[PDB]
Enzyme design. Sequence first.
Site, mmCIF file in Angstrom:
data_model
loop_
_atom_site.group_PDB
_atom_site.id
_atom_site.type_symbol
_atom_site.label_atom_id
_atom_site.label_comp_id
_atom_site.label_asym_id
_atom_site.label_seq_id
_atom_site.Cartn_x
_atom_site.Cartn_y
_atom_site.Cartn_z
ATOM 1 N N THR A 232 36.694 39.130 37.467
ATOM 2 C CA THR A 232 37.762 38.263 37.012
ATOM 3 C C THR A 232 37.077 37.060 36.360
ATOM 4 O O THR A 232 36.164 36.499 36.934
ATOM 5 C CB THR A 232 38.639 37.854 38.221
ATOM 6 O OG1 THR A 232 39.316 38.995 38.741
ATOM 7 C CG2 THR A 232 39.749 36.897 37.809
ATOM 8 N N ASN B 287 42.885 38.764 46.144
ATOM 9 C CA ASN B 287 42.415 39.942 46.915
ATOM 10 C C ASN B 287 42.159 39.701 48.411
ATOM 11 O O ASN B 287 41.641 40.586 49.121
ATOM 12 C CB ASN B 287 41.148 40.529 46.273
ATOM 13 C CG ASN B 287 41.413 41.148 44.876
ATOM 14 O OD1 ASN B 287 42.557 41.375 44.470
ATOM 15 N ND2 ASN B 287 40.368 41.387 44.157
ATOM 16 N N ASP C 80 41.313 45.652 47.549
ATOM 17 C CA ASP C 80 41.066 45.912 46.098
ATOM 18 C C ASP C 80 39.573 46.055 45.733
ATOM 19 O O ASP C 80 38.971 45.188 45.087
ATOM 20 C CB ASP C 80 41.773 44.893 45.201
ATOM 21 C CG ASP C 80 43.271 45.181 45.029
ATOM 22 O OD1 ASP C 80 43.759 46.239 45.467
ATOM 23 O OD2 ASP C 80 44.043 44.419 44.426
ATOM 24 N N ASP D 47 34.742 41.379 42.989
ATOM 25 C CA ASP D 47 36.010 40.846 42.560
ATOM 26 C C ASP D 47 36.641 39.962 43.619
ATOM 27 O O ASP D 47 37.831 40.044 43.888
ATOM 28 C CB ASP D 47 36.925 41.991 42.144
ATOM 29 C CG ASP D 47 38.086 41.532 41.299
ATOM 30 O OD1 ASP D 47 38.034 40.437 40.642
ATOM 31 O OD2 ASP D 47 39.116 42.202 41.291
ATOM 32 N N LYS E 18 38.413 36.884 44.895
ATOM 33 C CA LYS E 18 39.362 35.900 44.418
ATOM 34 C C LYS E 18 40.515 35.830 45.470
ATOM 35 O O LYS E 18 40.710 36.756 46.261
ATOM 36 C CB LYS E 18 39.890 36.276 43.023
ATOM 37 C CG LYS E 18 40.556 37.672 42.971
ATOM 38 C CD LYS E 18 40.889 38.005 41.547
ATOM 39 C CE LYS E 18 41.441 39.385 41.389
ATOM 40 N NZ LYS E 18 41.611 39.719 39.954
HETATM 41 C C1 LIG Z 1 39.035 49.333 37.073
HETATM 42 O O1 LIG Z 1 40.373 48.936 37.373
HETATM 43 C C2 LIG Z 1 40.898 49.383 38.564
HETATM 44 C C3 LIG Z 1 40.116 49.969 39.604
HETATM 45 C C4 LIG Z 1 40.718 50.365 40.772
HETATM 46 C C5 LIG Z 1 42.130 50.208 40.974
HETATM 47 O O2 LIG Z 1 42.678 50.589 42.074
HETATM 48 C C6 LIG Z 1 42.908 49.636 39.916
HETATM 49 C C7 LIG Z 1 44.333 49.466 39.976
HETATM 50 O O3 LIG Z 1 44.963 50.063 39.087
HETATM 51 C C8 LIG Z 1 45.097 48.638 40.914
HETATM 52 C C9 LIG Z 1 46.416 49.003 41.233
HETATM 53 C C10 LIG Z 1 47.144 48.205 42.074
HETATM 54 C C11 LIG Z 1 46.595 47.036 42.615
HETATM 55 C C12 LIG Z 1 47.433 46.224 43.480
HETATM 56 O O4 LIG Z 1 48.644 46.362 43.421
HETATM 57 N N1 LIG Z 1 46.852 45.331 44.328
HETATM 58 C C13 LIG Z 1 47.577 44.334 45.051
HETATM 59 C C14 LIG Z 1 47.986 43.175 44.099
HETATM 60 C C15 LIG Z 1 46.826 42.600 43.267
HETATM 61 C C16 LIG Z 1 45.981 41.578 44.023
HETATM 62 N N2 LIG Z 1 45.261 42.176 45.180
HETATM 63 C C17 LIG Z 1 46.168 42.425 46.289
HETATM 64 C C18 LIG Z 1 46.715 43.876 46.259
HETATM 65 N N3 LIG Z 1 47.408 44.012 47.519
HETATM 66 C C19 LIG Z 1 46.990 44.925 48.472
HETATM 67 O O5 LIG Z 1 46.002 45.657 48.236
HETATM 68 C C20 LIG Z 1 47.682 44.963 49.766
HETATM 69 C C21 LIG Z 1 47.058 45.693 50.796
HETATM 70 C C22 LIG Z 1 47.614 45.749 52.044
HETATM 71 N N4 LIG Z 1 48.787 45.059 52.323
HETATM 72 C C23 LIG Z 1 49.426 44.321 51.335
HETATM 73 C C24 LIG Z 1 48.862 44.260 50.063
HETATM 74 C C25 LIG Z 1 45.277 46.657 42.323
HETATM 75 C C26 LIG Z 1 44.541 47.467 41.476
HETATM 76 C C27 LIG Z 1 42.267 49.249 38.744
HETATM 77 F F1 LIG Z 1 43.021 48.721 37.754
#
Ligand SMILES: COc1ccc(O)c(C(=O)c2ccc(C(=O)N[C@@H]3CCCNC[C@H]3NC(=O)c3ccncc3)cc2)c1F
Lengths: 341, 20
Positions: free
Chosen positions: A192, A162, A175, A157, A159
């Site tokens: 994606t 992430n 992610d 994934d 992109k």
């Molecule tokens: C199969 O589907 C899956 C599998 C695993 C998962 O964890 C999830 C999630 O539900 C999920 C929940 C929240 C996020 C999330 O909020 N990620 C944020 C925003 C999306 C884009 N990627 C950046 C990410 N930000 C961070 O991880 C981050 C880390 C450290 N410092 C700041 C931001 C992503 C996935 C999911 F939907």
Amino acid sequence: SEQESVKEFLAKAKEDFLKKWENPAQNTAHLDQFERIKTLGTGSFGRVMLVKHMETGNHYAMKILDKQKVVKLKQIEHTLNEKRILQAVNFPFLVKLEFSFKDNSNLYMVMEYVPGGEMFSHLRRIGRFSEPHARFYAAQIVLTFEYLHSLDLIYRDLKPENLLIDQQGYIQVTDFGFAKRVKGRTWTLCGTPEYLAPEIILSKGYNKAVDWWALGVLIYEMAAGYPPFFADQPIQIYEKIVSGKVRFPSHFSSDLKDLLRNLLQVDLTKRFGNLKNGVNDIKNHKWFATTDWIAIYQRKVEAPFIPKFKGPGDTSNFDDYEEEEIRVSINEKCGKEFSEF
Amino acid sequence: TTYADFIASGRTGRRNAIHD
Ligand SMILES: COc1ccc(O)c(C(=O)c2ccc(C(=O)N[C@@H]3CCCNC[C@H]3NC(=O)c3ccncc3)cc2)c1F
């Protein structure tokens, strides 16, 4: 010999990874140790929040996932992969997992907070990166996939959404919800739309080479300001990807076009990254000739762009999201399903 | 221009993954 020195580092890295892979850390914190400040992003089953660890005053990013929702959409294994892999890996361009735990309602992962924001935000605002700036980021991903793939991990994934930018302007990959340890082929239709390799769309069974395709898409999007295949609906995106037809902006250097032609190769026996020479086909390509790979790993190279931030807890490089109260049920939900987490 | 077509497209925001 440089090639041998990398070979040595990877074998050591693999030994470290396997210890944690086979014996994963569990339950190393608790929810009421953290003050929840602001949402930094969301996903299908929850969100990532800035939090303050009350006894150390350190800030972290905490992913919160709702167990019931995960189970409803049949995404148990993938969420279990995320945590298991994230806790085992150790690399300068991968976001660090500090803690994890669960309660009756939710799964929690507490990672290092990466305050520079998502690459996506900066790329959209600025429009596109210059080839040297894109190359800088591309090099970090090359090494990261070199690391991950040696551990039999596929990320799946890639992109700009992430890729977080740290205080020194380097990437932190986040992610890992579709990351998977697999020695052979795998089959899940996931990722994606814009970044999906043709073999995924064609239900062909696929391997690590999907990450190298995705790197092609990323570098294009960084240097063009838009991805090679786009349209309003996914189905039209899929059609463009399988067709095997890419147009390049007139401003792309001929070296960049040649790289992308090798990464965006529909033919898997011809795709850079999937040849006998492996990742060296990429690292030795002419577009990367000025890249010093070890200086990048060590982080001695000067970032083309350093994000501004007024102190810890500053979220100004992140978009605003609506906040939601985290409810923790009195009854344990889906205990057996998440017992290893 | 292709840039202008992208910007008027429905896919310039954060892109969600698909799953099985
Ligand atoms: C199969 O589907 C899956 C599998 C695993 C998962 O964890 C999830 C999630 O539900 C999920 C929940 C929240 C996020 C999330 O909020 N990620 C944020 C925003 C999306 C884009 N990627 C950046 C990410 N930000 C961070 O991880 C981050 C880390 C450290 N410092 C700041 C931001 C992503 C996935 C999911 F939907």
